[PDB]
Amino acid sequence: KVFGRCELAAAMKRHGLDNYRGYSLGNWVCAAKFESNFNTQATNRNTDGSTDYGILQINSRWWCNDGRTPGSRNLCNIPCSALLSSDITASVNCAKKIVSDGNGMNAWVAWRNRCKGTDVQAWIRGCRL
Ligand SMILES: [Cl-]
Ligand SMILES: [Cl-]
Ligand SMILES: [Cl-]
Ligand SMILES: [Cl-]
Ligand code: NA
Ligand code: NA
Ligand code: NA
Ligand code: NA
Ligand code: NA
Ligand code: NA
Ligand code: NA
Ligand code: NA
Numbered sequence: 071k072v073f074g075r076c077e078l079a080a081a082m083k084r085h086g087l088d089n090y091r092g093y094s095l096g097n098w099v100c101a102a103k104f105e106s107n108f109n110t111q112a113t114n115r116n117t118d119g120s121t122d123y124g125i126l127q128i129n130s131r132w133w134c135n136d137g138r139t140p141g142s143r144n145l146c147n148i149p150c151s152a153l154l155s156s157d158i159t160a161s162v163n164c165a166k167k168i169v170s171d172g173n174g175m176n177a178w179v180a181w182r183n184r185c186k187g188t189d190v191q192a193w194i195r196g197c198r199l
Contacts (some may be wrong), residue, residue, distance in 0.1 A: 071109070071111070071127070072107075072109045072110070073102075073108040073109075074108070074194065075091060075108070075197070076194070076198070077105075077197065078125070078158075079095055079096075079098075079099050079110055079170075079199060081158050082099065082102075082158070083095055085159060086098060086162070087162055087165070089167075090166055090169065091169045091174060092174075093174070093175055094146075094190060095160065095193075095194065096190035096191045097175060097181065097185060097190045099147075099193035100181065100184070100185035100188070100193045101126060101180065101181040101185055102125045102126055104181070104184045104185065105122075105126050105127035105180050106125045106127055107113065107124065107126065108125065108153060109125070109159065110124055110156055112125070112126075112127065113154070114127060116129065116146065119138075119139060119140065120139045121136055123136060123150045123151075123154055124154050124155075125153075125158060125161050126161055126165050127178070128146070128150075128153050128164055130142055131143070132150065133146045133164055133167070134146055134150035134164065135148070135150060136150035140184040144152045146164035147159075152174070160194070193196075
């Protein structure tokens with residue numbers, strides 16, 4: 071599923087991401103935008119052999135099982151395929167664990183390089199939430 075901007079903001083809010091660990095909803099939408107352009111089905115292979123899945127490009131190195139990432143963990147206790155669903159629940163629940171891991175949203179390199187310090191509120195501007 072490719073979400074609309076406000077559509078995704080609303081879903082993220084309904085699943086408790088808005089201000090989760092102090093990160094406003096706009097931070098989350100911005101991260102999703104640059105990670106997957108709002109496409110739940112987005113996958114990308116990493117140089118280390120791991121793969122990133124879903125709207126927030128969650129990495130199989132630590133967070134999900136895809137069966138083909140040697141020496142990895144599955145800390146979210148889910149198949150990486152669950153992260154591609156039109157229903158964002160699994161992505162959100164896993165992202166909450168990731169953002170709690172110590173480095174906050176810096177876990178998402180794209181959030182650090184493209185969202186951090188910017189006017190993230192622009193990402194939810196105009197949305198009925
Ligand atoms: Cl957009
Ligand atoms: Cl915001
Ligand atoms: Cl594996
Ligand atoms: Cl933090
Ligand atoms: Na689509
Ligand atoms: Na914070
Ligand atoms: Na993609
Ligand atoms: Na894909
Ligand atoms: Na992989
Ligand atoms: Na994801
Ligand atoms: Na997703
Ligand atoms: Na695994």
